[PDB]
């Protein structure tokens, strides 16, 4: 009768779709609640400075 392209025929999927994605490369910045400085400044007086 005639030739037919593959895309011309609907295809049913025999594969189970298992979607696994990698974990995003995540960069941890230096985060400090109080720096050694803030902490040194937290003192009401510094004997050294005084």
């Amino acid at each position: 009768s005639h030739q037919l392209s593959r895309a011309d025929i609907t295809t049913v999927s025999t594969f189970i779709d298992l979607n696994i994605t990698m974990l995003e490369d995540h960069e941890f910045v230096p985060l400090e609640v109080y720096t050694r400085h803030e902490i040194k400044d937290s003192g009401l007086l510094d004997y050294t400075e005084v």
Binding site: H26, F28, V29, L31, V33
Partner: protein, 50 residues
């Protein structure tokens, strides 16, 4: 010294982080605030803090 009113001159909390994208979610009757920018997750009670 130059006098200033106490209420707008002191600040018992200090702006520590400015998070552009802080996702908020509700789970286990608590709010999780996760920041990917500083890689930090906080847990709060569902109620607002007066």
């Amino acid at each position: 010294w130059d006098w200033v009113p106490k209420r707008p001159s002191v600040c018992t909390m200090t702006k520590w982080q400015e998070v552009d994208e802080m996702l908020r979610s509700e789970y286990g009757g608590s709010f999780r605030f996760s920041s990917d920018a500083i890689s930090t997750t906080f847990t709060t009670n569902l109620t607002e803090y007066p």
